[PDB]
Design a protein around this ligand. Structure first.
Ligand SMILES: CC[C@H]1CN2CCc3cc(OC)c(OC)cc3[C@@H]2C[C@@H]1C[C@H]1NCCc2cc(O)c(OC)cc21
Ligand SMILES: [NH3+]CCC[NH2+]CCCC[NH2+]CCC[NH3+]
Ligand SMILES: [Mg+2]
Ligand SMILES: [Mg+2]
Ligand SMILES: [Mg+2]
Ligand SMILES: [Mg+2]
Ligand SMILES: [Mg+2]
Ligand SMILES: [Mg+2]
Ligand SMILES: [Mg+2]
Ligand SMILES: [Mg+2]
Ligand SMILES: [Mg+2]
Ligand SMILES: [Mg+2]
Ligand SMILES: [Mg+2]
Ligand SMILES: [Mg+2]
Ligand SMILES: [Mg+2]
Ligand SMILES: [Mg+2]
Ligand SMILES: [Mg+2]
Ligand SMILES: [Mg+2]
Ligand SMILES: [Mg+2]
Ligand SMILES: [Mg+2]
Ligand SMILES: [Mg+2]
Ligand SMILES: [Mg+2]
Ligand SMILES: [Mg+2]
Ligand SMILES: [Mg+2]
Ligand SMILES: [Mg+2]
Ligand SMILES: [Mg+2]
Ligand SMILES: [Mg+2]
Ligand SMILES: [Mg+2]
Ligand SMILES: [Mg+2]
Ligand SMILES: [Mg+2]
Ligand SMILES: [Mg+2]
Ligand SMILES: [Mg+2]
Ligand SMILES: [Mg+2]
Ligand SMILES: [Mg+2]
Ligand SMILES: [Mg+2]
Ligand SMILES: [Mg+2]
Ligand SMILES: [Mg+2]
Ligand SMILES: [Mg+2]
Ligand SMILES: [Mg+2]
Ligand SMILES: [Mg+2]
Ligand SMILES: [Mg+2]
Ligand SMILES: [Mg+2]
Ligand SMILES: [Mg+2]
Ligand SMILES: [Mg+2]
Ligand SMILES: [Mg+2]
Ligand SMILES: [Mg+2]
Ligand SMILES: [Mg+2]
Ligand SMILES: [Mg+2]
Ligand SMILES: [Mg+2]
Ligand SMILES: [Mg+2]
Ligand SMILES: [Mg+2]
Ligand SMILES: [Mg+2]
Ligand SMILES: [Mg+2]
Ligand SMILES: [Mg+2]
Ligand SMILES: [Mg+2]
Ligand SMILES: [Mg+2]
Ligand SMILES: [Mg+2]
Ligand SMILES: [Mg+2]
Ligand SMILES: [Mg+2]
Ligand SMILES: [Mg+2]
Ligand SMILES: [Mg+2]
Ligand SMILES: [Mg+2]
Ligand SMILES: [Mg+2]
Ligand SMILES: [Mg+2]
Ligand SMILES: [Mg+2]
Ligand SMILES: [Mg+2]
Ligand SMILES: [Mg+2]
Ligand SMILES: [Mg+2]
Ligand SMILES: [Mg+2]
Ligand SMILES: [Mg+2]
Ligand SMILES: [Mg+2]
Ligand SMILES: [Mg+2]
Ligand SMILES: [Mg+2]
Ligand SMILES: [Mg+2]
Ligand SMILES: [Mg+2]
Ligand SMILES: [Mg+2]
Ligand SMILES: [Mg+2]
Ligand SMILES: [Mg+2]
Ligand SMILES: [Mg+2]
Ligand SMILES: [Mg+2]
Ligand SMILES: [Mg+2]
Ligand SMILES: [Mg+2]
Ligand SMILES: [Mg+2]
Ligand SMILES: [Mg+2]
Ligand SMILES: [Mg+2]
Ligand SMILES: [Mg+2]
Ligand SMILES: [Mg+2]
Ligand SMILES: [Mg+2]
Ligand SMILES: [Mg+2]
Ligand SMILES: [Mg+2]
Lengths: 191, 260, 125, 148
RNA sequence: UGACCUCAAAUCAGGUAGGACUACCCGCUGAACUUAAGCAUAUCAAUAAGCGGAGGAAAAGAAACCAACAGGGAUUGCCUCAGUAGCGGCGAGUGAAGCGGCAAAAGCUCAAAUUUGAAAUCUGGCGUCUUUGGCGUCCGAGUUGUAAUUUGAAGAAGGUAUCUUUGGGCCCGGCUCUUGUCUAUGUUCCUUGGAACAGGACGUCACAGAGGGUGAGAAUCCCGUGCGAUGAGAUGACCCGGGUCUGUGUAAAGUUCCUUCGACGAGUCGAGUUGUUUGGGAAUGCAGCUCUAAGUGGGUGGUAAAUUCCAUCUAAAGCUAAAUAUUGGCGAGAGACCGAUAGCGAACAAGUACAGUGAUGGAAAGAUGAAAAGAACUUUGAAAAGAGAGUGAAAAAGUACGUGAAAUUGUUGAAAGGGAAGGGCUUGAGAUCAGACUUGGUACCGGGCCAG
RNA sequence: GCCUAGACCGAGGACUGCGGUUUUUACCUAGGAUGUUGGCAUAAUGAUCUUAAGUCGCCCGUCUUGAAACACGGACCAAGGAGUCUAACGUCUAUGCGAGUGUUUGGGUGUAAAACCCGUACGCGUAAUGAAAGUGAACGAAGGUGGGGGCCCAUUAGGGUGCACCAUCGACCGAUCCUGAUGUGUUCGGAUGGAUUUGAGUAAGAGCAUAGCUGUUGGGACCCGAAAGAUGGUGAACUAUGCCUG
RNA sequence: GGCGAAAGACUAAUCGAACCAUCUAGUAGCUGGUUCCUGCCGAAGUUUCCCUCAGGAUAGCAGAAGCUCGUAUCAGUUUUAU
RNA sequence: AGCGUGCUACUUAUACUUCACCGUGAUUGCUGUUUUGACGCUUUCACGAGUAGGCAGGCGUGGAGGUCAGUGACGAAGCCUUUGCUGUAAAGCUGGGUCGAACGGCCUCUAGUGCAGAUCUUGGUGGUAGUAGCAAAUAUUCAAAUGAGAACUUUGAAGACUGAAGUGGGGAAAGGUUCCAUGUCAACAGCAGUUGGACAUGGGUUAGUCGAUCCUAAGAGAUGGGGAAGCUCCGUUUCAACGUGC
């Protein structure tokens, strides 16, 4: 049962696995039908874009802090800053998120600029609007017209300024202070 | 095969002691199926050994760069007359390869006009080869929607389609292809190099943008045409050159004389 | 080549649709070409064969024979012509069955519906 | 392809390469990793020492995002400078104007100190650096700027 | 003499449920074979069988979420995380989630509020009309609470600068679905053949050289194919484009600011214990029993506890398309699949014949010929049949039907044969086959084979 | 030294060589058979089949130390009949690119399951080590010594340079143990110098991907084969026993 | 489970636990079989561990692929010295 | 022609020697004459046992891409055959006969790809073998009729038996047309057949009084209720407001 110098394997095939084998023979068929659904949905509502405008948000965790991506909806504060009520915004292609808030100014300002850019390119029709004006427009792709753009990393030339304390020493001292903060505070309180 | 084929029986082995093999047997009585062997790959009406499954591997991955390597090699082979002739194309009356035709042939809309152009440019003897090559397929594949076989004709490559695809659609053996989307199934049919390709002028001039050159970057992202491992592919002149022949020792006899 | 996704190139499906065709479908299946004279007279090239048409046999051992259709025997996929008979050693005569595609119509049996059909097909009645 | 397999070559020979004495059987020795302490001990001790037993402390609900910190060495640090401006930076770089290398924005957590730098000032922005990496960066007249 | 409450009866007026199908779906219940080279925890498996309940999808779903970031933001699925953290006689084994890329995206509703200057709400009967309903009226329900108003993202009541938006019904189109009708070019010549659909010659059409039929391989004989054109029926508060009639818009809704408020789900949360389950480990979920709350309270923050903070949501009430699943149903298109002992058990009057008391079990079986032209008639025979004849391209195709192998068998011919036969080697005999007078060159030159 | 009888064979296919005789740039017996004669080509000759004779020859397959066995299967014939596919892997090989590599979850596109195109992420690799907190790879020409193919200078030999690789002594990184500078939230920090210790490490990257054979593990798992176990159902027309009615 | 004047008897030719279908192609260190040709190479029944003794793993024996080199320094042998 | 011993000759293994041929391994040379095969040609030497097993090169089969503008109704495929040829072989090709609609060579791809065995599977067929056998229940015979045909049918005559607890005359269960008439003999009636419970065509079962139907028996089982997740279990007037009353 165990023989030769081989890696030890974990092949989880002791259940009735053959009754639950999903082979994706329909990958191409699903691609084509997905494209047809996408075309029909666009042509139904043209020239209105098929995608609602989405915000830009920082990705969570220490591993994806650096990246920025499309969020779910603009916060109520952001829409307040651009003077759009959420109920109205949902009817002009803007997504709303009551759950997200703005602790910091950077994401708030980015999304306010994004909303103002969309509002400048928005044209809302009405009863007085004729089919000549409606036909004068093309169905744009909002996800590409207002793309999520990563802030550029700092590069180029800058003056070198060398502090007396090294960066490694700074990190070591920060670690030590965090590690012994509680016991040092207890000792000082007792003293 | 069906997942339950050969297994729709309640057959049970009789065991030993009844002077018959220990294969499972059908129970009951009153029919001739009763007492007959079941479930075995050797048994009439049993299931096959290792019944075929749908989760067999059907599609095969090929590295994109290697696939492009092969596409470039097949395109290059289309310009070698010996390869096209060994490939079987009736190209003896074409004055040079590649065969490039003017762009008016991108706009012919009738099959009659397209056939006239093929005749004019010398590519209709290969169509006649396709016509004369029609045979009933040998084997049971003719019961499966593959009833006739025939040769492959010229591949006509265009840059703009103004009716050429439909004009050549019904001509037997002729394939049409945009210069933007060329693949090995058309460029080397049967894995055999040397497809007879008729280029329109637009397609021929677009080739250099599609695959790039030393002065033009390819439209394919980050793609460069491959490099050969040998610079002079004619090794006879390398061997019989001044540089090599000036430093070699004199040759012996083609056949050693028998001395004992 | 066929383009429609509603058209099948299956040999088994085509043969099943042929051999299980209803009598009404077999009426269309048993079409015959018109002679050159009727083709230029009516500007129609083929019609479903009918009972009282006159035909000329153009293929087979009875090629050159002429006669009036006696029955469109749709069950056997054949027509029986007036005097195209095989004489058994019994002495009795049985009609010879001929496919309508192996004859040409030389005289049409006309009525209001045949005329409407000819005008429908772009012809002149 | 099956035509290349040795099953095609064993046709006509009685045992199909399995032997007349051994008689290819269902599961002699057990299934899987059976008998790893009893009759497959000679195999596991020889080829997989350390297999049995516990070492170290458990960690309930370990989130690997916490430990994300890709390394970049100093001999690979100048590959983060723009290729079109690398030679100009390597020539015209000084204390007054040195290239900034944002390692976090390129996907690195710690700067390590293997290799040698060009004797050219650089400003390195990192979450973490090693002691020798920062000593070597300062020696060429550069600086390490801690970020988060 | 009458209310009310609770509970009954009626063949009272009008409704509704049950049962079926099985592939997917929501739950309950629940093994063992098996693996551990034995075996009991474990594994198989939170699987099979059993039970209850749906739909075209179901379920889930707009955080009592994830996190620990510079924060994300309903649900679902894919790729990845990851055979990882973890669980495990820490053995065999097993094993998720957050982040990230994508498919699809859609949001919301009650309870808790005095309408209190007016139960403003609703089922039903009766009448009537333009009838998936409107109007009128009368009982009834209902104050032990039916409407409007609000749902935490808020919101209410006052004050406030004013601004921005807007209801419904029919008629023709478009889109979607189904369906009817209509369409290019040889049956020209020769040969073979029973038949031309074969070969050859000359051609034609081609946005049609897919497929099928017709007496053999037919683009051009027929149906179709390709290209479109043009009618009919449907369907859609919840698709738009136009018309047209009513809009009862001091109405409804949003927007800024100030003040006062801001109700928010209990045998529930939570705790103990028991059983089961989970990767969940001093206990992941579920369930039983015991205990049983609170109001900046409550839950969660993956090591039990007390103390102090912090973060994040807001349970114990509810609805909701899409992306996802689909050995079933309905309709289609296909294949490097099988080719009648194969492929479904079933290509056929197959779940048939037949067996079994019963649950159940369950076959074998395709092919004359282009066409029955399925052999008139004569003769022998009791008849079946035979012999002539006849049809057919063929009867070396006669339904005991294409081809018609082997085992086994008859006849004819050849040969051998004292208690087996068969085999190898070698030669004889007999039979069969082969080859140089060559693709010989001009009486001769020369050659081939076997020999001295 | 000389004479003399017989048998089997004749590979090769212009010349080239070594010798010999030299009367000779000629000849020979000297790097493998030629000459001549007869017969035959309706045939002498060769092959096969059948058979006789001589001689030898036990029934195959199987397990087994040992089978013709008085061991097992096999009356005969036809058709069917047994190492497969998949998930994850080891070695080797081929191929593409290469400090990168992998288009195909998806998107674009299409003559529509094809072919063609696109990119973020992600996987693997480019860093290890420790249980972990954590730390994290140049004294030197990326080291010395002995070899080392090849190259350079030579001219037997000899010198120079020596990649891969081998043996050996070192250096660097992590862990373990020891020492403990300036300093300090006075308990932290950890410079510096060491140690018969230890790592699947560094020491001018080698990997990633596809495919093939072979091997591995889980799967019905090369094919056929239990005695059993479990879940849900069907039987008292036989029979056992009670009851009711004859 | 039944039933048993008791034999483990009988419970539809089935009884020391009926019959039917399914789990199920249950597992088998055990028996049987395992399908074309030629060419080249060619074993083991021994070591150690195992509820191990009809079985495995391990080492040995064997094949294949090669790689670095090219007489370098090898040997189932002798001689001489010890 | 025995035993001990010496000598000469002679006999013959797949062994040894020389030579031919096959293959394997090594080895010589081959590009200004390499020259449309250098994966080729060529020189030389040695070697050849083999189970289990490994590897290599080939033969054959179904299907797929390409090619031979391949074969074919003037005969494809299949099958039979001392018609032969080629290959060490797996096999390939071919003459004749039969037959009637498709099929092959080559470069590649692919696999449900090769049978003598598995008390293998399904179908078919032998020897045994014209063999075992067709022997319980007393028993048949003569004549005529019918018929192609009579041991077996019909009629007559006789001889017998069952012997009223029947081989008689009815029924219950069970069968289902077997009943009756006419025709009829392919199969069935283990000989026969003119006969038949066979085969074919028709005909045939008449109820107020005979049964069923109704009653209750052992028992079965709704309702009201009570269990049970539930399939359903209990209970039979039970903790019930129980009359479709007369
Ligand atoms: C053998 C195939 C059957 C069985 N299966 C499986 C179960 C099932 C269940 C269904 O509902 C649960 C159902 O509903 C439609 C259909 C079916 C089908 C029906 C099908 C026959 C049906 N095929 C289509 C046409 C047709 C025409 C007829 O004349 C006709 O005669 C009876 C029947 C039919
Ligand atoms: N999943 C089917 C088997 C059910 N067996 C339950 C698993 C028992 C193991 N519990 C894990 C130990 C508790 N942490
Ligand atoms: Mg089958
Ligand atoms: Mg074939
Ligand atoms: Mg083997
Ligand atoms: Mg064996
Ligand atoms: Mg073994
Ligand atoms: Mg032990
Ligand atoms: Mg009523
Ligand atoms: Mg199992
Ligand atoms: Mg076990
Ligand atoms: Mg076992
Ligand atoms: Mg056991
Ligand atoms: Mg189930
Ligand atoms: Mg339904
Ligand atoms: Mg859906
Ligand atoms: Mg739902
Ligand atoms: Mg909420
Ligand atoms: Mg979420
Ligand atoms: Mg589990
Ligand atoms: Mg009313
Ligand atoms: Mg045809
Ligand atoms: Mg709440
Ligand atoms: Mg517990
Ligand atoms: Mg449970
Ligand atoms: Mg618990
Ligand atoms: Mg809720
Ligand atoms: Mg379906
Ligand atoms: Mg079948
Ligand atoms: Mg069958
Ligand atoms: Mg037949
Ligand atoms: Mg014939
Ligand atoms: Mg015939
Ligand atoms: Mg026949
Ligand atoms: Mg025979
Ligand atoms: Mg005798
Ligand atoms: Mg002989
Ligand atoms: Mg002879
Ligand atoms: Mg010779
Ligand atoms: Mg002998
Ligand atoms: Mg044996
Ligand atoms: Mg044995
Ligand atoms: Mg023995
Ligand atoms: Mg033997
Ligand atoms: Mg013996
Ligand atoms: Mg015995
Ligand atoms: Mg035995
Ligand atoms: Mg026997
Ligand atoms: Mg066979
Ligand atoms: Mg990457
Ligand atoms: Mg680490
Ligand atoms: Mg290294
Ligand atoms: Mg047990
Ligand atoms: Mg009874
Ligand atoms: Mg007893
Ligand atoms: Mg006893
Ligand atoms: Mg019994
Ligand atoms: Mg019992
Ligand atoms: Mg098996
Ligand atoms: Mg079994
Ligand atoms: Mg054993
Ligand atoms: Mg050997
Ligand atoms: Mg044994
Ligand atoms: Mg003597
Ligand atoms: Mg000899
Ligand atoms: Mg050998
Ligand atoms: Mg062998
Ligand atoms: Mg196949
Ligand atoms: Mg031909
Ligand atoms: Mg033939
Ligand atoms: Mg035919
Ligand atoms: Mg071919
Ligand atoms: Mg097979
Ligand atoms: Mg056989
Ligand atoms: Mg065998
Ligand atoms: Mg047998
Ligand atoms: Mg048999
Ligand atoms: Mg006898
Ligand atoms: Mg007897
Ligand atoms: Mg008497
Ligand atoms: Mg008596
Ligand atoms: Mg009686
Ligand atoms: Mg009778
Ligand atoms: Mg008889
Ligand atoms: Mg008889
Ligand atoms: Mg009868
Ligand atoms: Mg009575
Ligand atoms: Mg009673
Ligand atoms: Mg009851
Ligand atoms: Mg009840």
């Amino acid at each position: 049962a165990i023989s030769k110098n081989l890696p030890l394997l974990n092949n989880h095939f002791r259940k009735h696995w053959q009754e639950r084998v999903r082979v994706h023979f329909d990958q191409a068929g699903k691609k084509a039908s997905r494209r047809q659904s996408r075309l029909r949905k666009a042509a139904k509502i043209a020239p209105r874009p098929i995608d609602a405008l989405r915000p830009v948000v920082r990705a969570p965790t220490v591993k994806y802090n650096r990246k920025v991506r499309a969020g779910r909806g603009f916060t109520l504060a952001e829409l307040k800053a651009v003077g759009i009520a959420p109920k109205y915004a949902r009817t002009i292609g803007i997504s709303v998120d009551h759950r997200r808030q703005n602790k910091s100014q950077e994401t708030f300002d980015a999304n306010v600029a994004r909303l103002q850019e969309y509002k400048s390119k928005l044209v809302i029709f009405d009863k007085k609007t004729k089919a000549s004006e409606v036909a004068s427009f093309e169905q744009v792709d909002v996800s590409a017209t207002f793309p999520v753009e990563q802030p550029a990393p700092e590069s180029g030339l800058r003056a070198v300024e060398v502090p007396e304390q090294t960066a490694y020493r700074t990190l070591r001292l920060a670690r030590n202070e965090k590690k012994y903060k509680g016991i040092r505070e207890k000792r000082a309180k007792e003293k | 095969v069906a997942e339950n084929a050969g297994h729709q029986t309640s057959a049970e082995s009789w065991g030993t002691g009844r002077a018959v093999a220990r294969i499972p047997r059908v129970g009951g009585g009153g029919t001739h199926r009763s007492g007959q062997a079941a479930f075995g790959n050797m048994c009439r009406g049993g299931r096959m050994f290792a019944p075929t499954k749908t989760w067999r591997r059907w599609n095969v991955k090929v590295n994109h760069n290697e696939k492009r390597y092969a596409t470039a090699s097949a395109i290059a082979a289309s310009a070698v007359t010996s390869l096209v002739l060994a490939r079987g194309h009736r190209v003896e009356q074409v004055k040079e390869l590649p065969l490039v035709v003017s762009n008016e042939f991108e706009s012919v809309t009738k099959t009659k006009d397209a056939v006239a152009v093929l005749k004019a440019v010398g590519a209709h003897k290969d169509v006649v080869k396709v016509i004369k090559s029609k045979k009933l397929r040998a084997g049971k594949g003719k019961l499966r929607g593959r009833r006739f076989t025939q040769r492959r004709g010229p591949l006509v490559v265009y840059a703009q389609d103004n009716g050429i695809v439909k004009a050549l659609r019904n001509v037997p053996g002729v394939e049409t292809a945009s210069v933007k989307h060329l693949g090995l199934l058309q460029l080397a049919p049967g894995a055999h190099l040397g497809r007879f390709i008729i280029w329109t002028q637009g397609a021929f001039e677009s080739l250099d943008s599609v695959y790039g050159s030393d002065s033009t970057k390819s439209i394919k992202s980050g793609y460069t045409l491959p490099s050969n491992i040998i610079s002079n592919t004619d090794v006879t002149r390398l061997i019989n050159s001044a540089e090599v022949q000036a430093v070699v020792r004199p040759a012996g006899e083609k056949t050693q004389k028998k001395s004992h | 080549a066929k383009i429609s996704q509603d058209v099948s190139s299956s040999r088994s499906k085509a043969r099943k649709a042929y051999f299980t065709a209803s009598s009404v479908e077999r009426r269309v299946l048993l079409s015959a070409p018109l002679s050159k004279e009727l083709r230029q007279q009516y500007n129609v090239k083929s019609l479903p064969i009918r009972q009282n048409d006159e035909v000329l046999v153009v293929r087979g051992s009875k090629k050159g024979s002429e006669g009036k259709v006696n029955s469109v025997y749709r069950l056997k996929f054949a027509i029986q012509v007036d005097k195209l008979q095989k004489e058994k050693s019994n002495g009795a005569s049985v009609p010879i069955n001929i496919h309508p595609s192996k004859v040409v119509i030389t005289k049409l049996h006309l009525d209001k519906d045949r005329k409407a059909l000819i005008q429908r097909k772009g012809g002149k009645a | 392809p099956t035509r290349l397999t040795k099953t095609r070559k064993h046709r006509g020979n009685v045992s199909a390469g399995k032997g007349r004495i051994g008689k290819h059987r269902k599961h002699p020795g057990g299934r899987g990793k059976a008998g790893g302490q009893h009759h497959h001990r000679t195999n596991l001790d020889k080829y997989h020492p350390g297999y049995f037993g516990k070492v170290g402390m458990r960690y309930f609900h370990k989130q690997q995002n916490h430990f994300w910190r890709p390394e970049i060495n100093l001999d690979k640090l100048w590959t983060l400078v723009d290729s079109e401006k690398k030679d100009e930076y390597l020539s015209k770089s000084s204390a007054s104007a040195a290239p900034v290398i944002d390692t976090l924005a390129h996907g690195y957590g710690k700067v390590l100190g293997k290799g040698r730098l060009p004797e050219v000032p650089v400003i390195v922005k990192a979450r973490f650096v090693s002691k020798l990496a920062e000593e070597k960066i300062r020696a060429v007249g550069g600086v390490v700027e801690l970020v988060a």
